Structures are given as C-alpha cells and as structure tokens.
C-alpha cells in the first residue's frame, strides 16, 4: 500500500498511461501501490514544488515521477533539490528530468534513465573503430564537462592494446574579446582527418563557421559531436557541415507510456522487496515547511536497495553516480537536406549498423579478387 | 527608473546596518532596500525567497552564512531558487569548496577566498622554505578532492611528482593503518587537510606513534586549527587564518559597491529587460541574466575597504590576505602575512615542532635497500 | 618461502658496490620468477608491468 | 583568393607583381596567418622600386 504518484506536463495521452498503469501486475511482490495521475502546466517551479508537496501530504505518498515537454535543466535541478530536501525517492521518465547532471548531491536519493559521459565516449570510440578510423583530434570549449570527457577519453585510449595516433589537443576559449583571430590561426594547425567537438550549440555553430571560413571542412573533414551539441533534431542551425556524425538518446522507438509503466512497476517491486527484507517502511510527515527535524528517520536503505532491481526480464540497476548501467542509444547522420536519420543502434556495448558499406559523401572504385 | 535589490540574512542589527549603508551609498536611478529573515527549513526558505522576488522584482539576491556551524545548506536553497530564473546571486560568507563547479551553481558569486587557494598557499610556503618532498594527506570529500587536485596541478606545473598520497574515509574510527603506511617513507613534510573532528584523532594517532618529535613539520589549514582540534594539537604546527574571514560587515560595503557599479554599467545597454515579478506565474529565463553576470565578473574594483576586489574564472575572489599563526606554549600568534605575491615575516620568532630553534631539513636518507 | 644461499657474478658485483658506497642491502628473489613484460590487456582496462 | 592562398604548403613562395598587388598579397598572408615564422617570400626588383 505504497503511495505512487504520476505527474504529466503539456499534452499527453493520459488514457494510454492510465491503461498501462492499470495493466501492471504486482501480485508476487504484494506491493499493491496506488496510482495517482495528476496534470500540471509549465507555470513555474514553485507551483510544481507546491503541487508535489500537496500530493505527498495527500494520502501517504512515498514517491512521484514527473515528465515535462520542455528542455531546461532548471526544472530537473529544482526536482533534484526537492528530492534531496524531502529525502523522498523521485525519478525522471523523459524530457527535462532526463538530463544527466554533472555533480550529484551526496545525501540525495535520485535516479534517472540515460547515458553517462564515459558511455558516449565509448560509443564514439566503437563507431570509429568500426569505421576503420585510426586518427582523431581533441577540441573542446572551456566547459568543465567537456574537459572531463576529453580526459576520460584520453585515459581510456592510453591503456589500449591497439594502436592510436593523437595529433594535439585544443582548449581555446570563445569568451575572450577579439580572440577570434587567434582561434582561427590555431585551428589551421589541425591536420588529422577526424576532429571531435564537445561544446554548446552556439559554440558549435561558431566553430563550424570558423571551419567554413578556414576552408578545411568540405571533403577531408570528419566532425564528431556529443548528444548535448544537437539537443533538438527537428531544428537545424543550417551552419553545420554535411555528413556530421553524432550520438543521441533512443527516443523515436522507445515509448514514453510503456517506459513509465515499466519504471513504476520496477520501483514498486523494489519497494516491496525492501519492505519485506529490511522490515522497515519510511512513512514520515510528508510536509514542506519545517523539514529540518524530518531527517530523524534515515532513508539510506531505500536508496541503497534501488540500485538493484529487475522486472519483466530487464535490467534496470543504476550506478553510484546516478546513471543507468545499460542505456539505449542511437546513431544519427546528416543527409543532403536538413534532417536527422537513424543509422544504427547500440545496446549492451554491442553495435548494430543497418548497412555493411558506409555511405561516402569518379572515385570509390570496386576491385574484384580471387 | 527605479530598481530595487534583494537580500536574506540574520542578525537584524546587521540588516539595519546594511540598509543604512545602502541608503548612504544611494546618494552617489533609484535603489530600494528589501530583506527578510531565514526560515528553519529549505522548502520554507525557498518559498520565502520566491515571495520576496515576486514582491520586489529585484535582479540580484545577496546570501550570507546563517548561525549554524555548517552554513552550507542555506546557500544551496537560494542558489537553486535563483537558478530557475537565471538570476545572479552573490555570496558573502561562502567558503565551501563544493560550490565551485559551474554545473551545480550556474550564477553564483563569492566574496571570500575558497579552500582551493589553500593548496597554492601551501605550495608557496614550501617553495619559500626550500622544500621538495611533501606528503599530502586528505580525507575523502569534495573539498579534499579539490585541494588534492590543486596540489597535484601545482606540483606538475613545476615538473615535480608527489612523494606519497594517502586518502582516508570520512569518519573512520581507526586510522592507525594510514599512519603506519605513511611512516614507512623518507619524507618529513606532512600536509593534513580534513575536518576538525578527524583532526583530533589524526593528531592523537601521530602523537601515539612518536611522529611529532624533532625533524617533523606539520602544515595544516584553517579548518584543522579551529574547533576542538586545538586541545590535542601539537606544538610547532603552522596553520592559516583569514584576515577578514570572521568579519562580515567589511565585505558587505564592497559587495554593495560592486552591485551598484554593475547596475550602473548594465542600465546603459540596449535590449535590456528587468526581472519579471511573476515568480509563480512564468518560468522563463531572463535574457539579462548572462550579460549582467558577465559584466559583473569583469567589473574590476579600483579600491575598497577590504583591499582589491577581483573575480577569477570560476567565480572566485582572488587577492586575499592570510595570517600565518603559530601554536607556541598553547598560544596562537601571527608571525607573518601573505599578501598574494609573497609572505613577509614579522620580527617575532617561530618555534618549530620538538623545540628545535633551527629550521629542520624536512628530509631523510634511507640506508636500507631491497 | 625458505632461506637459501646466493653467490655468483651478480652477488660479487653487489658486494663490491656495497663495499665501495658503504650501504646495506637485503637480497631476495622474485615470486614471479620471470623478467617481465608489458601487460596491456584491454580486458581489465589497466596496464602495468609484472 | 584568401581561400586559394591557404592551399600553399611549401616553405618558400615567389611573388612577382606591382607594389599595390604585393602589398595586398602581404596583407592577405598576414590575415591568413602563415607569414610569421615558416614563410619565405622572394620578390623581383620591380616589387620594391
């Protein structure tokens, strides 16, 4: 009889989500968790926090998972702060809450579904190895996450049995005044056929404009960007070179209601297993004001047990940093027209391309041998 | 037009003093005063901050340390509340090294020296003392990890590797293993950076193993000197202490002057939009948040009441003053002051550990080899 | 481990160096019994000598 | 012209034009950036005058 809440934002198929939640069966776990579907707009984060507190104080609610159609990380940060303050378990299905923060709180209980910084680098290295690439470059902005990802990629490539050729590393800062000439002069020193870029959208657009002004971006250039460089596949800045390769989250094939129902069922099963094993259920005063004395009942057992859960023949165990062990990723490619096309999908460190020969964009002759 | 400011602090006498200072500085564009107290919870404090921002529609919020000994949770709430609207926030007594990465805190300004400068101060002291072999002992924590990274960077800048690094768990009851492992080296410069609780146990374990006699040098910080660590502290230990760290009214005037200069330099720009008073109504990001923060970061102060005021890259107040204290006959007394460039000693004498008047070499020669 | 005896060219050179530089040493064989190689196996994601 | 000048890779380049043309070529080379250390320019007697 654990209180589970579900909040939605914007337009969404509430009937399908309700049917998926009602179709869930947890007779073996004997959790008997209730469902509470509540709709909310995008007014402000304070209103969302007030609604979350009201839902928690409504009828012994011990958990809530919300989804938003926006993309601002401020909502996810406020949700993580509220979860750390109230010491309650909260999860993010998709949307703005699906963003992976860099530094999580120590005394917090939060879990999200998505890939990590090292997972994207590993996927990029696997794609480069599959594409017969043996040379690359390192270029990033002054962001700390990009520098950390570059350092992790360098540490992973250092302890590699196969060969590797690193030309140089670029750490130019675009925030300086009148520093475009120095950046353009330093960009000409690049000679490798592949270059990696990890920055924001505006920084990526500026780098692409500088590369187009230099002229080494038409034929003998290969640019690789992370999932945070694109953000929205529907919108294109019309300044990126054709043929760019970047990774992204599997959202076109994964269904939001089915994933939400699976996550709710996994959370209910984990809560039932914890209540059966530890024989302790945390049910404190779910209030908003005067929450300093609410930390008398420690909830570290629920957070430690939530990193190990499985249901319906699937693995949903998280990590110590708050990231999924086996995430779902896809490969995107740039065609002649501005659009994003699915090239391949990777899962459990296993690549699966939809073409044996990679499309190159008269040369490229075919030679037969016996 | 008229633009008001916001603040949240305790000690209403200091609030009235700051209001009088603001009213006096207004005579040098109309500014108002709006401040409130602190609540006993994080959600209540966030709600009060949102109400104050909706009532005043200010563009900046000043946060100080509360009467609690930690004074770390109060700064996270105001920062998370201001991050939703991309409103800049300036801190007065913020010294925690966890609030350093720009990912967690998007817009946050400090007015004191963080714990990261302690590593640079220790490196400068070791260079002035002609030392080349030191042992860094830091506990597993965010501030400890940041200090260890800063020390490693300062060592690699001079192309000198560390002798031996030992890490301990926060709250370990038994630490004799780390002491026994560190006592099997050839270096004598032991650097300690941890909390005041574990500092007493570390000093007890060092005195029990006879590791505080002649030929040993102990370099600690402000956290290891204050608290209950002075009861079991050993003689000859050299620590650090902030010049104006305890005082909070001296930096308030400099912060108010910097805020006034930023408001004067930002009101003369095009496409400027004031902060919306709809805290609960709208959740949009103010476009005047990043520009104002960038203008305030480069707003170098000519002169103030606490010396030169500047801003580092990741929101840090450089050009700080430190007092080199010395524990002699259970009495702390300054012996020098490091004014950024170098430390000039006074006419007083210093007593090293063990009663040796002469300066110790801080190194040994191993005679047994394997 | 059992105590054994050690002598030869390397032992003579070690004794000569110890008498020349006036230091102390503790000679002991290696448990692996091999010279060593570069263990850069990517299965453990680490590289170290043995 | 600025895009075609970037294709040069040899350490020595020969220029033979007028004074204004030589000045424009030097300005273009300075804007490109490959004229500081690893550049060697040779001009005829009519380029200086």
PDB file of N, CA and C in Angstrom, chain A residues 207-288:
ATOM      1  N   UNK A 207      32.202  27.387 -34.054  1.00  0.00           N
ATOM      2  CA  UNK A 207      33.304  26.554 -34.528  1.00  0.00           C
ATOM      3  C   UNK A 207      33.066  26.123 -35.970  1.00  0.00           C
ATOM      4  N   UNK A 208      31.817  25.795 -36.313  1.00  0.00           N
ATOM      5  CA  UNK A 208      31.505  25.415 -37.687  1.00  0.00           C
ATOM      6  C   UNK A 208      31.691  26.589 -38.640  1.00  0.00           C
ATOM      7  N   UNK A 209      31.300  27.793 -38.214  1.00  0.00           N
ATOM      8  CA  UNK A 209      31.507  28.973 -39.049  1.00  0.00           C
ATOM      9  C   UNK A 209      32.993  29.253 -39.244  1.00  0.00           C
ATOM     10  N   UNK A 210      33.790  29.094 -38.185  1.00  0.00           N
ATOM     11  CA  UNK A 210      35.230  29.306 -38.300  1.00  0.00           C
ATOM     12  C   UNK A 210      35.852  28.269 -39.229  1.00  0.00           C
ATOM     13  N   UNK A 211      35.388  27.019 -39.149  1.00  0.00           N
ATOM     14  CA  UNK A 211      35.911  25.979 -40.029  1.00  0.00           C
ATOM     15  C   UNK A 211      35.526  26.237 -41.481  1.00  0.00           C
ATOM     16  N   UNK A 212      34.304  26.721 -41.716  1.00  0.00           N
ATOM     17  CA  UNK A 212      33.888  27.052 -43.076  1.00  0.00           C
ATOM     18  C   UNK A 212      34.681  28.235 -43.619  1.00  0.00           C
ATOM     19  N   UNK A 213      34.996  29.208 -42.761  1.00  0.00           N
ATOM     20  CA  UNK A 213      35.815  30.335 -43.191  1.00  0.00           C
ATOM     21  C   UNK A 213      37.245  29.894 -43.481  1.00  0.00           C
ATOM     22  N   UNK A 214      37.744  28.909 -42.733  1.00  0.00           N
ATOM     23  CA  UNK A 214      39.094  28.406 -42.969  1.00  0.00           C
ATOM     24  C   UNK A 214      39.153  27.627 -44.278  1.00  0.00           C
ATOM     25  N   UNK A 215      38.156  26.782 -44.530  1.00  0.00           N
ATOM     26  CA  UNK A 215      38.081  26.018 -45.756  1.00  0.00           C
ATOM     27  C   UNK A 215      38.365  24.538 -45.620  1.00  0.00           C
ATOM     28  N   UNK A 216      38.817  24.079 -44.456  1.00  0.00           N
ATOM     29  CA  UNK A 216      39.090  22.658 -44.245  1.00  0.00           C
ATOM     30  C   UNK A 216      37.891  21.939 -43.630  1.00  0.00           C
ATOM     31  N   UNK A 217      36.716  22.115 -44.241  1.00  0.00           N
ATOM     32  CA  UNK A 217      35.517  21.475 -43.715  1.00  0.00           C
ATOM     33  C   UNK A 217      34.631  20.869 -44.800  1.00  0.00           C
ATOM     34  N   UNK A 218      35.105  20.735 -46.038  1.00  0.00           N
ATOM     35  CA  UNK A 218      34.269  20.251 -47.120  1.00  0.00           C
ATOM     36  C   UNK A 218      34.372  18.767 -47.410  1.00  0.00           C
ATOM     37  N   UNK A 219      35.576  18.286 -47.711  1.00  0.00           N
ATOM     38  CA  UNK A 219      35.767  16.902 -48.131  1.00  0.00           C
ATOM     39  C   UNK A 219      36.591  16.089 -47.146  1.00  0.00           C
ATOM     40  N   UNK A 220      37.759  16.584 -46.745  1.00  0.00           N
ATOM     41  CA  UNK A 220      38.631  15.833 -45.863  1.00  0.00           C
ATOM     42  C   UNK A 220      38.467  16.187 -44.400  1.00  0.00           C
ATOM     43  N   UNK A 221      37.223  16.368 -43.963  1.00  0.00           N
ATOM     44  CA  UNK A 221      36.919  16.725 -42.585  1.00  0.00           C
ATOM     45  C   UNK A 221      35.845  15.796 -42.039  1.00  0.00           C
ATOM     46  N   UNK A 222      36.059  15.316 -40.816  1.00  0.00           N
ATOM     47  CA  UNK A 222      35.087  14.490 -40.111  1.00  0.00           C
ATOM     48  C   UNK A 222      34.910  15.043 -38.705  1.00  0.00           C
ATOM     49  N   UNK A 223      33.692  15.469 -38.387  1.00  0.00           N
ATOM     50  CA  UNK A 223      33.383  16.076 -37.103  1.00  0.00           C
ATOM     51  C   UNK A 223      32.464  15.163 -36.307  1.00  0.00           C
ATOM     52  N   UNK A 224      32.807  14.955 -35.038  1.00  0.00           N
ATOM     53  CA  UNK A 224      32.020  14.143 -34.121  1.00  0.00           C
ATOM     54  C   UNK A 224      31.604  15.021 -32.951  1.00  0.00           C
ATOM     55  N   UNK A 225      30.315  14.998 -32.624  1.00  0.00           N
ATOM     56  CA  UNK A 225      29.779  15.836 -31.554  1.00  0.00           C
ATOM     57  C   UNK A 225      29.020  14.951 -30.576  1.00  0.00           C
ATOM     58  N   UNK A 226      28.831  15.423 -29.351  1.00  0.00           N
ATOM     59  CA  UNK A 226      28.102  14.646 -28.345  1.00  0.00           C
ATOM     60  C   UNK A 226      26.596  14.846 -28.494  1.00  0.00           C
ATOM     61  N   UNK A 227      25.850  14.250 -27.561  1.00  0.00           N
ATOM     62  CA  UNK A 227      24.396  14.354 -27.589  1.00  0.00           C
ATOM     63  C   UNK A 227      23.902  15.736 -27.178  1.00  0.00           C
ATOM     64  N   UNK A 228      24.703  16.493 -26.431  1.00  0.00           N
ATOM     65  CA  UNK A 228      24.307  17.822 -25.981  1.00  0.00           C
ATOM     66  C   UNK A 228      24.581  18.907 -27.014  1.00  0.00           C
ATOM     67  N   UNK A 229      25.217  18.570 -28.137  1.00  0.00           N
ATOM     68  CA  UNK A 229      25.505  19.579 -29.150  1.00  0.00           C
ATOM     69  C   UNK A 229      24.301  19.809 -30.056  1.00  0.00           C
ATOM     70  N   UNK A 230      23.458  18.794 -30.245  1.00  0.00           N
ATOM     71  CA  UNK A 230      22.282  18.921 -31.098  1.00  0.00           C
ATOM     72  C   UNK A 230      21.051  19.334 -30.294  1.00  0.00           C
ATOM     73  N   UNK A 231      20.688  18.540 -29.290  1.00  0.00           N
ATOM     74  CA  UNK A 231      19.542  18.847 -28.458  1.00  0.00           C
ATOM     75  C   UNK A 231      18.216  18.541 -29.120  1.00  0.00           C
ATOM     76  N   UNK A 232      17.877  19.296 -30.163  1.00  0.00           N
ATOM     77  CA  UNK A 232      16.628  19.126 -30.894  1.00  0.00           C
ATOM     78  C   UNK A 232      16.949  18.781 -32.340  1.00  0.00           C
ATOM     79  N   UNK A 233      16.575  17.568 -32.757  1.00  0.00           N
ATOM     80  CA  UNK A 233      16.830  17.141 -34.128  1.00  0.00           C
ATOM     81  C   UNK A 233      15.902  17.819 -35.129  1.00  0.00           C
ATOM     82  N   UNK A 234      14.758  18.337 -34.677  1.00  0.00           N
ATOM     83  CA  UNK A 234      13.832  18.993 -35.594  1.00  0.00           C
ATOM     84  C   UNK A 234      14.368  20.335 -36.074  1.00  0.00           C
ATOM     85  N   UNK A 235      15.091  21.054 -35.221  1.00  0.00           N
ATOM     86  CA  UNK A 235      15.649  22.353 -35.567  1.00  0.00           C
ATOM     87  C   UNK A 235      17.112  22.205 -35.968  1.00  0.00           C
ATOM     88  N   UNK A 236      17.494  22.895 -37.037  1.00  0.00           N
ATOM     89  CA  UNK A 236      18.865  22.850 -37.542  1.00  0.00           C
ATOM     90  C   UNK A 236      19.370  24.276 -37.731  1.00  0.00           C
ATOM     91  N   UNK A 237      20.581  24.597 -37.271  1.00  0.00           N
ATOM     92  CA  UNK A 237      21.102  25.960 -37.433  1.00  0.00           C
ATOM     93  C   UNK A 237      21.583  26.283 -38.839  1.00  0.00           C
ATOM     94  N   UNK A 238      21.579  25.312 -39.751  1.00  0.00           N
ATOM     95  CA  UNK A 238      21.989  25.476 -41.143  1.00  0.00           C
ATOM     96  C   UNK A 238      23.439  25.927 -41.288  1.00  0.00           C
ATOM     97  N   UNK A 239      24.266  25.724 -40.264  1.00  0.00           N
ATOM     98  CA  UNK A 239      25.668  26.112 -40.303  1.00  0.00           C
ATOM     99  C   UNK A 239      26.617  24.937 -40.115  1.00  0.00           C
ATOM    100  N   UNK A 240      26.098  23.737 -39.866  1.00  0.00           N
ATOM    101  CA  UNK A 240      26.955  22.574 -39.668  1.00  0.00           C
ATOM    102  C   UNK A 240      27.289  21.924 -41.008  1.00  0.00           C
ATOM    103  N   UNK A 241      28.474  21.334 -41.133  1.00  0.00           N
ATOM    104  CA  UNK A 241      28.840  20.689 -42.399  1.00  0.00           C
ATOM    105  C   UNK A 241      28.056  19.406 -42.620  1.00  0.00           C
ATOM    106  N   UNK A 242      27.843  19.085 -43.893  1.00  0.00           N
ATOM    107  CA  UNK A 242      27.106  17.881 -44.249  1.00  0.00           C
ATOM    108  C   UNK A 242      27.921  16.636 -43.921  1.00  0.00           C
ATOM    109  N   UNK A 243      27.241  15.618 -43.403  1.00  0.00           N
ATOM    110  CA  UNK A 243      27.895  14.379 -43.036  1.00  0.00           C
ATOM    111  C   UNK A 243      28.368  14.298 -41.604  1.00  0.00           C
ATOM    112  N   UNK A 244      27.865  15.159 -40.723  1.00  0.00           N
ATOM    113  CA  UNK A 244      28.273  15.123 -39.326  1.00  0.00           C
ATOM    114  C   UNK A 244      27.687  13.903 -38.629  1.00  0.00           C
ATOM    115  N   UNK A 245      28.487  13.289 -37.759  1.00  0.00           N
ATOM    116  CA  UNK A 245      28.090  12.105 -37.008  1.00  0.00           C
ATOM    117  C   UNK A 245      28.006  12.478 -35.535  1.00  0.00           C
ATOM    118  N   UNK A 246      26.867  12.177 -34.914  1.00  0.00           N
ATOM    119  CA  UNK A 246      26.660  12.475 -33.505  1.00  0.00           C
ATOM    120  C   UNK A 246      25.735  11.427 -32.906  1.00  0.00           C
ATOM    121  N   UNK A 247      25.885  11.204 -31.604  1.00  0.00           N
ATOM    122  CA  UNK A 247      25.078  10.236 -30.884  1.00  0.00           C
ATOM    123  C   UNK A 247      23.896  10.953 -30.246  1.00  0.00           C
ATOM    124  N   UNK A 248      22.859  10.184 -29.928  1.00  0.00           N
ATOM    125  CA  UNK A 248      21.659  10.731 -29.309  1.00  0.00           C
ATOM    126  C   UNK A 248      20.947   9.613 -28.562  1.00  0.00           C
ATOM    127  N   UNK A 249      19.966  10.003 -27.754  1.00  0.00           N
ATOM    128  CA  UNK A 249      19.195   9.043 -26.980  1.00  0.00           C
ATOM    129  C   UNK A 249      18.106   8.411 -27.837  1.00  0.00           C
ATOM    130  N   UNK A 250      17.819   7.142 -27.555  1.00  0.00           N
ATOM    131  CA  UNK A 250      16.798   6.395 -28.287  1.00  0.00           C
ATOM    132  C   UNK A 250      15.425   6.856 -27.814  1.00  0.00           C
ATOM    133  N   UNK A 251      14.825   7.789 -28.557  1.00  0.00           N
ATOM    134  CA  UNK A 251      13.510   8.315 -28.227  1.00  0.00           C
ATOM    135  C   UNK A 251      12.452   8.047 -29.285  1.00  0.00           C
ATOM    136  N   UNK A 252      12.842   7.813 -30.541  1.00  0.00           N
ATOM    137  CA  UNK A 252      11.856   7.560 -31.586  1.00  0.00           C
ATOM    138  C   UNK A 252      11.236   6.175 -31.456  1.00  0.00           C
ATOM    139  N   UNK A 253      12.001   5.196 -30.973  1.00  0.00           N
ATOM    140  CA  UNK A 253      11.498   3.834 -30.830  1.00  0.00           C
ATOM    141  C   UNK A 253      10.964   3.558 -29.430  1.00  0.00           C
ATOM    142  N   UNK A 254      11.585   4.135 -28.405  1.00  0.00           N
ATOM    143  CA  UNK A 254      11.134   3.920 -27.037  1.00  0.00           C
ATOM    144  C   UNK A 254       9.843   4.685 -26.779  1.00  0.00           C
ATOM    145  N   UNK A 255       8.854   3.995 -26.210  1.00  0.00           N
ATOM    146  CA  UNK A 255       7.577   4.611 -25.902  1.00  0.00           C
ATOM    147  C   UNK A 255       7.574   5.193 -24.503  1.00  0.00           C
ATOM    148  N   UNK A 256       7.038   6.413 -24.379  1.00  0.00           N
ATOM    149  CA  UNK A 256       7.013   7.068 -23.072  1.00  0.00           C
ATOM    150  C   UNK A 256       6.069   6.369 -22.104  1.00  0.00           C
ATOM    151  N   UNK A 257       4.840   6.009 -22.486  1.00  0.00           N
ATOM    152  CA  UNK A 257       3.946   5.369 -21.506  1.00  0.00           C
ATOM    153  C   UNK A 257       4.418   3.992 -21.078  1.00  0.00           C
ATOM    154  N   UNK A 258       4.915   3.181 -22.014  1.00  0.00           N
ATOM    155  CA  UNK A 258       5.410   1.856 -21.654  1.00  0.00           C
ATOM    156  C   UNK A 258       6.622   1.953 -20.736  1.00  0.00           C
ATOM    157  N   UNK A 259       7.544   2.872 -21.034  1.00  0.00           N
ATOM    158  CA  UNK A 259       8.712   3.050 -20.179  1.00  0.00           C
ATOM    159  C   UNK A 259       8.314   3.560 -18.799  1.00  0.00           C
ATOM    160  N   UNK A 260       7.335   4.467 -18.738  1.00  0.00           N
ATOM    161  CA  UNK A 260       6.879   4.978 -17.448  1.00  0.00           C
ATOM    162  C   UNK A 260       6.240   3.863 -16.629  1.00  0.00           C
ATOM    163  N   UNK A 261       5.427   3.022 -17.274  1.00  0.00           N
ATOM    164  CA  UNK A 261       4.803   1.909 -16.566  1.00  0.00           C
ATOM    165  C   UNK A 261       5.845   0.909 -16.082  1.00  0.00           C
ATOM    166  N   UNK A 262       6.849   0.619 -16.915  1.00  0.00           N
ATOM    167  CA  UNK A 262       7.909  -0.296 -16.504  1.00  0.00           C
ATOM    168  C   UNK A 262       8.693   0.265 -15.325  1.00  0.00           C
ATOM    169  N   UNK A 263       9.000   1.563 -15.355  1.00  0.00           N
ATOM    170  CA  UNK A 263       9.703   2.173 -14.238  1.00  0.00           C
ATOM    171  C   UNK A 263       8.885   2.166 -12.962  1.00  0.00           C
ATOM    172  N   UNK A 264       7.582   2.439 -13.073  1.00  0.00           N
ATOM    173  CA  UNK A 264       6.713   2.408 -11.900  1.00  0.00           C
ATOM    174  C   UNK A 264       6.645   1.000 -11.323  1.00  0.00           C
ATOM    175  N   UNK A 265       6.536  -0.009 -12.191  1.00  0.00           N
ATOM    176  CA  UNK A 265       6.494  -1.389 -11.719  1.00  0.00           C
ATOM    177  C   UNK A 265       7.806  -1.787 -11.055  1.00  0.00           C
ATOM    178  N   UNK A 266       8.936  -1.364 -11.626  1.00  0.00           N
ATOM    179  CA  UNK A 266      10.232  -1.682 -11.034  1.00  0.00           C
ATOM    180  C   UNK A 266      10.380  -1.007  -9.677  1.00  0.00           C
ATOM    181  N   UNK A 267       9.930   0.245  -9.562  1.00  0.00           N
ATOM    182  CA  UNK A 267      10.013   0.952  -8.288  1.00  0.00           C
ATOM    183  C   UNK A 267       9.127   0.282  -7.246  1.00  0.00           C
ATOM    184  N   UNK A 268       7.925  -0.144  -7.645  1.00  0.00           N
ATOM    185  CA  UNK A 268       7.036  -0.825  -6.710  1.00  0.00           C
ATOM    186  C   UNK A 268       7.626  -2.156  -6.260  1.00  0.00           C
ATOM    187  N   UNK A 269       8.228  -2.905  -7.188  1.00  0.00           N
ATOM    188  CA  UNK A 269       8.852  -4.173  -6.825  1.00  0.00           C
ATOM    189  C   UNK A 269      10.032  -3.958  -5.886  1.00  0.00           C
ATOM    190  N   UNK A 270      10.842  -2.926  -6.143  1.00  0.00           N
ATOM    191  CA  UNK A 270      11.968  -2.635  -5.262  1.00  0.00           C
ATOM    192  C   UNK A 270      11.491  -2.226  -3.875  1.00  0.00           C
ATOM    193  N   UNK A 271      10.433  -1.413  -3.806  1.00  0.00           N
ATOM    194  CA  UNK A 271       9.896  -1.009  -2.510  1.00  0.00           C
ATOM    195  C   UNK A 271       9.336  -2.205  -1.750  1.00  0.00           C
ATOM    196  N   UNK A 272       8.644  -3.107  -2.451  1.00  0.00           N
ATOM    197  CA  UNK A 272       8.117  -4.301  -1.800  1.00  0.00           C
ATOM    198  C   UNK A 272       9.242  -5.195  -1.294  1.00  0.00           C
ATOM    199  N   UNK A 273      10.291  -5.375  -2.101  1.00  0.00           N
ATOM    200  CA  UNK A 273      11.425  -6.187  -1.671  1.00  0.00           C
ATOM    201  C   UNK A 273      12.117  -5.572  -0.461  1.00  0.00           C
ATOM    202  N   UNK A 274      12.266  -4.244  -0.451  1.00  0.00           N
ATOM    203  CA  UNK A 274      12.884  -3.580   0.693  1.00  0.00           C
ATOM    204  C   UNK A 274      12.031  -3.729   1.946  1.00  0.00           C
ATOM    205  N   UNK A 275      10.714  -3.541   1.820  1.00  0.00           N
ATOM    206  CA  UNK A 275       9.834  -3.679   2.976  1.00  0.00           C
ATOM    207  C   UNK A 275       9.773  -5.118   3.470  1.00  0.00           C
ATOM    208  N   UNK A 276       9.998  -6.090   2.585  1.00  0.00           N
ATOM    209  CA  UNK A 276       9.991  -7.487   3.004  1.00  0.00           C
ATOM    210  C   UNK A 276      11.306  -7.876   3.671  1.00  0.00           C
ATOM    211  N   UNK A 277      12.428  -7.368   3.158  1.00  0.00           N
ATOM    212  CA  UNK A 277      13.732  -7.740   3.698  1.00  0.00           C
ATOM    213  C   UNK A 277      14.059  -6.952   4.964  1.00  0.00           C
ATOM    214  N   UNK A 278      14.138  -5.624   4.852  1.00  0.00           N
ATOM    215  CA  UNK A 278      14.529  -4.805   5.993  1.00  0.00           C
ATOM    216  C   UNK A 278      13.412  -4.652   7.017  1.00  0.00           C
ATOM    217  N   UNK A 279      12.169  -4.959   6.641  1.00  0.00           N
ATOM    218  CA  UNK A 279      11.004  -4.861   7.519  1.00  0.00           C
ATOM    219  C   UNK A 279      10.791  -3.446   8.051  1.00  0.00           C
ATOM    220  N   UNK A 280      11.295  -2.439   7.342  1.00  0.00           N
ATOM    221  CA  UNK A 280      11.158  -1.044   7.738  1.00  0.00           C
ATOM    222  C   UNK A 280      10.664  -0.233   6.549  1.00  0.00           C
ATOM    223  N   UNK A 281       9.563   0.485   6.741  1.00  0.00           N
ATOM    224  CA  UNK A 281       8.962   1.315   5.707  1.00  0.00           C
ATOM    225  C   UNK A 281       9.015   2.764   6.178  1.00  0.00           C
ATOM    226  N   UNK A 282       9.668   3.666   5.440  1.00  0.00           N
ATOM    227  CA  UNK A 282       9.742   5.071   5.863  1.00  0.00           C
ATOM    228  C   UNK A 282       8.469   5.818   5.496  1.00  0.00           C
ATOM    229  N   UNK A 283       7.729   6.252   6.516  1.00  0.00           N
ATOM    230  CA  UNK A 283       6.479   6.990   6.338  1.00  0.00           C
ATOM    231  C   UNK A 283       6.464   8.175   7.297  1.00  0.00           C
ATOM    232  N   UNK A 284       7.326   9.157   7.071  1.00  0.00           N
ATOM    233  CA  UNK A 284       7.370  10.334   7.942  1.00  0.00           C
ATOM    234  C   UNK A 284       6.316  11.356   7.524  1.00  0.00           C
ATOM    235  N   UNK A 285       6.327  12.493   8.216  1.00  0.00           N
ATOM    236  CA  UNK A 285       5.391  13.574   7.925  1.00  0.00           C
ATOM    237  C   UNK A 285       5.768  14.226   6.600  1.00  0.00           C
ATOM    238  N   UNK A 286       5.002  13.930   5.550  1.00  0.00           N
ATOM    239  CA  UNK A 286       5.262  14.472   4.216  1.00  0.00           C
ATOM    240  C   UNK A 286       4.780  15.922   4.155  1.00  0.00           C
ATOM    241  N   UNK A 287       5.555  16.795   4.789  1.00  0.00           N
ATOM    242  CA  UNK A 287       5.261  18.219   4.843  1.00  0.00           C
ATOM    243  C   UNK A 287       6.360  19.001   4.135  1.00  0.00           C
ATOM    244  N   UNK A 288       6.065  20.269   3.850  1.00  0.00           N
ATOM    245  CA  UNK A 288       7.008  21.158   3.178  1.00  0.00           C
ATOM    246  C   UNK A 288       7.755  22.044   4.169  1.00  0.00           C
TER     247      UNK A 288
END
